[PDB]
Amino acid sequence: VLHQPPAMSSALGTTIRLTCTLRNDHDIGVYSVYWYQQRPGHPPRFLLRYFSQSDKSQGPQVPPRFSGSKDVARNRGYLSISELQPEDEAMYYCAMGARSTHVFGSGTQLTVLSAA
């Protein structure tokens, strides 16, 4: 139901956009997209919930360089991370539903490269 690419890489200081793709006889225009970061040996950490530019919630202490968006026509939810830092290297999960249920995507492993 939720596709995420297995792995993405980007260099220090850049901006990357992770995609979470509602496949696809459901409408992303009616769901909040939840995003979580997970580092090995640690629990998931809530980053942000994104429904629209006027209906979103940033997680506690998550800097604004983590931001949500959507492409509704493509059934996609996005997590953008600007000014990538070495500690952003982690697993990123999207999730949908409010529970009731919370279905997770398979997660994108993000590698932050020392050099582009």
Side-chain angles (χ1 to χ4, degrees):
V1 70
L2 298 178
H3 177 274
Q4 298 185 261
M8 300 180 75
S9 196
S10 202
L12 292 168
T14 64
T15 292
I16 195 165
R17 184 169 70 172
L18 274 63
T19 302
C20 171
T21 277
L22 217 195
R23 260 155 95 82
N24 216 289
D25 291 314
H26 296 276
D27 177 9
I28 210 174
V30 308
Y31 291 99
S32 282
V33 186
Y34 293 76
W35 286 95
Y36 298 90
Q37 184 184 242
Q38 189 174 216
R39 296 203 184 87
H42 290 78
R45 177 202 178 114
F46 177 72
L47 297 171
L48 61 90
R49 177 196 55 84
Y50 187 91
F51 181 83
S52 82
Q53 278 299 305
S54 61
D55 180 358
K56 60 191 177 189
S57 303
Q58 192 80 357
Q61 301 176 353
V62 176
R65 67 189 186 85
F66 293 83
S67 65
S69 53
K70 288 177 165 168
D71 184 339
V72 174
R74 300 196 75 168
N75 242 19
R76 291 168 180 187
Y78 295 118
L79 170 64
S80 297
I81 311 173
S82 67
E83 264 295 324
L84 282 164
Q85 305 180 179
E87 60 269 18
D88 306 329
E89 184 164 308
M91 183 64 56
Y92 288 84
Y93 293 110
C94 63
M96 285 185 210
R99 33 289 179 197
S100 196
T101 184
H102 212 217
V103 62
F104 288 73
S106 44
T108 293
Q109 181 59 225
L110 171 64
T111 297
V112 179
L113 306 162
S114 296

